[PDB]
């Protein structure tokens, strides 16, 4: 929900690490235009989580959302950015006709359509290289069969479905050998007392009766044990009470 963004070859690295993800206001409300992705479903992201999450901010056409796919070739998918075969993220697009556009042409952020070679996945290429396709060199200028790359946007909110400003935020997920740090939301239930019920806590699982405790405790603890090494205490994960 930013007010600015970046180019598709000048991708910033929003390093989401050591966070708590809240998808009850973003995924469940869904104020975006389309909500469709592959690999991992968005309903599995609340019950499964990953090591490092990386994000970006780039606005493209509505015709280039078919190019954002794992294993895709074509116009954008080999020359501006590339999605790998192990892509476990999701791609969300939203029409930004009232925010990201500009009257009298949008002449500020640039994008490409071709390249010298096939780039690597998540490659930040900001080069202004001089091309030579034939047998005579170009000395820095374009020519017959000599071309040059670097041109900006054409956004305006008065037209149809093809090249409206669509803000695409690719939330790339990555599971490594390191333990997880950013995990999504999970629902809670009510708490009943003075009854033989089961326990499903943040770090406890068992069956017992919840009564009022009269002992002292440390707030950085999860549970406590008695003199016979049995679990006789539980801290609430929401409130500071045992």
């Amino acid at each position: 929900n930013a007010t600015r963004f970046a180019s598709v070859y000048a991708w910033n690295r929003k390093r989401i690490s050591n966070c708590v993800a809240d998808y009850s206001v973003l995924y469940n409300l869904a104020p975006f235009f389309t909500f469709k992705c592959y690999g991992v479903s968005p309903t599995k992201l609340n019950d499964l989580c990953f090591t490092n999450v990386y994000a970006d901010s780039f606005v493209i056409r509505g015709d280039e959302v078919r190019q954002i796919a794992p294993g895709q070739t074509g116009n954008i998918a080999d020359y501006n950015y590339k999605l790998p075969d192990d892509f476990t993220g999701c791609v969300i697009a939203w029409n930004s006709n009232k925010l990201d556009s500009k009257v009298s042409g949008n002449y500020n952020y640039l994008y490409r359509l071709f390249r010298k070679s096939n780039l690597k996945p998540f490659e930040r290429d900001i080069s202004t290289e001089i091309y030579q396709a034939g047998n005579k060199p170009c000395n820095g200028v374009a020519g017959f069969n000599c071309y040059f790359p670097l041109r900006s946007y054409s956004f305006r909110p008065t037209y149809g479905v093809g090249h409206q400003p669509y803000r695409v935020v690719v939330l790339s997920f990555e599971l490594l050998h390191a333990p997880a740090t950013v995990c999504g939301p999970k629902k809670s239930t009510n708490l009943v007392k003075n009854k033989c019920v089961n326990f499903n806590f943040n770090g406890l699982k068992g069956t017992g009766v919840l009564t009022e405790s009269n002992k002292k405790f440390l707030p950085f603890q999860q549970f406590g044990r008695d003199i016979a090494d049995t679990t006789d205490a539980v801290r609430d994960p929401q409130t500071l009470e045992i």
């Binding site: 029409n95 359509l113 041109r151 149809g160 479905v161 093809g162």
Partner: protein
């Protein structure tokens, strides 16, 4: 560094402001057609001159080393639409004079003022005025004024203005390694790089001649049917042996024969098929007429449209304070978007153009992720040939029953479809030899084999042996009959209307062979068939990445331009015009003249 690895990187800093400098002249021309103010015309000029200089700034810096090192087929087919230098190969006094002669040629065509020389005290406006007085005036002296005087006050100074315009037009194309400007319209038809499917520019001269030989039995029976029905209207003006006069064809020149339908009715006891009387009872508005017409696009198998089409484009004229020009043009404004500006009324001709102008949207929708040089037609006439397949399928009485339009018990005999097919004969077949004799006139005055005195004498000698009309007065070498139209004065291509009627018929003859329709092809409707879109989806997405020779292989399978879909579409029209022409004269002759008294 390797020669084989380097394919194509032109589309970075060319193909992103080829739209964007045209974008700033796109809405500025669109606001010129909706909000005609004093400052909404100035933004067309300074932004359109930046895009006009963009095609000449990169052309001067593309003059280094030649073409023959390329290997890929995708490189060469987009290279032909950029290496045309245009006007930038002439001098400073010759190239900029072409820009000034094109602005004075479109001004007097739109703002012309010509009226009666007998009583010039009341002098009227041309374009809403003279377009509608041709239909209702049943007089010989009244129709003589609207054809002769219009080329006598507007077209009198174009004859010393078109002679040096042709001479400068030869210099800009002979330096572009072509033989003439005559193959500049045939430069889009040039196919090279594929073995077995090579279509040169010299092959197109015999191909229009090959498809014109078999239309001469079909056109001369329509030439003898309008003439035989004008005996009770004009008893002593039109000869039964000779040709028809050219000042009574219904329009300003005689391209369309649409106003000659009400006078040549075959049977007056049965009513015509009409949506206009049944529209005002159910109270339709502007939201209905595009939504059920877009239901025709879903049922073949093309996907839906989002909210950007309904809140941006309007269908109602924005008040009576501000003037809005509403000519039917589907706005192809760059890399796959369409805003529709149409002054819609309760009119059957407005209803068929709702399917026509949305048929140019569905061609550019499929290659919306393709480059802009491939975002075009397969030729110039390929864009409007795939647009009117939705209008001829919506004029079918089997389609009107499934929606809820006309009466559910309507009689359909053999004498019902003949009045519909002769309405299509003056829309499709009636403009077909008229497209031939003007494009052959364009291909005979550009090469320069003829002198200046045979410039206009060759024009009226072709019309008495190709289309079968004769002028009532003779013209000298100071007037111009073909140069008073919309396409020739604003420098547009006229080859695109001969291939409009040919590529449309090739697609509709095979579309319900997939949908399994038994009967004639004027009862063919392409709706309620999900497998009918899959034959089109490999054709709607090929644009100019594949040429027009390989584009016809997946529907009809003919690599050449043939006339055989045009014959069995009109199979009651070939049989029922034969028995009524037993005693009249078949064809025309070159001896009758109205001024040879």
């Amino acid at each position: 560094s390797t020669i084989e690895e380097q394919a194509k990187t032109f589309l970075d800093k060319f193909n992103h402001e080829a739209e964007d400098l045209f974008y700033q002249s796109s809405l500025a021309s669109w606001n010129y057609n909706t909000n005609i103010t004093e400052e909404n015309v100035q933004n067309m000029n300074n932004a359109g001159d930046k895009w006009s200089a963009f095609l000449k700034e990169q052309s001067t810096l593309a003059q280094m080393y030649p073409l023959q090192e390329i290997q890929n087929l995708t490189v060469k087919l987009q290279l032909q639409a950029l290496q045309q230098n245009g006007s930038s190969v002439l001098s400073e006094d010759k190239s900029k004079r072409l820009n000034t002669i094109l602005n004075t040629m479109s001004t007097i065509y739109s703002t012309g003022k010509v009226c009666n020389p007998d009583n010039p005290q009341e002098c009227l406006l041309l374009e809403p005025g003279l377009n509608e007085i041709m239909a209702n005036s049943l007089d010989y002296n009244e129709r003589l004024w609207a054809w002769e005087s219009w080329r006598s006050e507007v077209g009198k100074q174009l004859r010393p203005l078109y002679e040096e315009y042709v001479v400068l037009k030869n210099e800009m194309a002979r330096a572009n390694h072509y033989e003439d400007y005559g193959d500049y319209w045939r430069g889009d038809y040039e196919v090279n790089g594929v073995d077995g499917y090579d279509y040169s520019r010299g092959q197109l001269i015999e191909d229009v001649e090959h498809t014109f030989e078999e239309i001469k039995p079909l056109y001369e029976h329509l030439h003898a049917y309008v003439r035989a029905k004008l005996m009770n209207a004009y008893p002593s003006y039109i000869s039964p042996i000779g040709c028809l006069p050219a000042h009574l064809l219904g329009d300003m020149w005689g391209r369309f024969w649409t106003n000659l339908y009400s006078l040549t009715v075959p049977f007056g006891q049965k009513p015509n098929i009409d949506v206009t009387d049944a529209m005002v009872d159910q109270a339709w508005d502007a939201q209905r007429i595009f939504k059920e017409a877009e239901k025709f696009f879903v049922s073949v198998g093309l996907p839906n449209m989002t909210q950007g089409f309904w809140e941006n484009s309007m269908l109602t004229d924005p008040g009576n304070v501000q003037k809005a020009v509403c000519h039917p043009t589907a706005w192809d404004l760059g890399k796959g978007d369409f805003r529709i500006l149409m002054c819609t009324k309760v009119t059957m001709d407005d209803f068929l153009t709702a399917h026509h102008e949305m048929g140019h949207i569905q061609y550019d929708m499929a290659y919306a992720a393709q480059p802009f040089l491939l975002r075009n037609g397969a030729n110039e006439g390929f864009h409007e040939a795939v647009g009117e397949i939705m209008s001829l399928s919506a004029a079918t009485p089997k389609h009107l029953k499934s929606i809820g339009l006309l009466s559910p018990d309507f009689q359909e005999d053999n004498e019902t479809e003949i009045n519909f097919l002769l309405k299509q004969a003056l829309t499709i077949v009636g403009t077909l030899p008229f497209t031939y004799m003007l494009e052959k006139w364009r291909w005979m005055v550009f090469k320069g084999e003829i002198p200046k005195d045979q410039w206009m004498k060759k024009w009226w000698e072709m019309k008495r042996e190709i289309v079968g009309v004769v002028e009532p007065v003779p013209h000298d070498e100071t007037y111009c009959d073909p140069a008073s139209l919309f396409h020739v004065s604003n420098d547009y291509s006229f080859i695109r209307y001969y291939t409009r009627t040919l590529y449309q018929f090739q697609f509709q003859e095979a579309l319900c062979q997939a949908a399994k329709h038994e009967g004639p092809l004027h009862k063919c409707d392409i709706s309620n068939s999900t497998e009918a879109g899959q034959k089109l989806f490999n054709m709607l997405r090929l644009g100019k990445s594949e040429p027009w020779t390989l584009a016809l292989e997946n529907v009809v399978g003919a690599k050449n331009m043939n006339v055989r879909p045009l014959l069995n579409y009109f199979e009651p029209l070939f049989t029922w015009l034969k028995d009524q022409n037993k005693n009249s004269f078949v064809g025309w002759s070159t001896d009758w003249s109205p001024y040879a008294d």
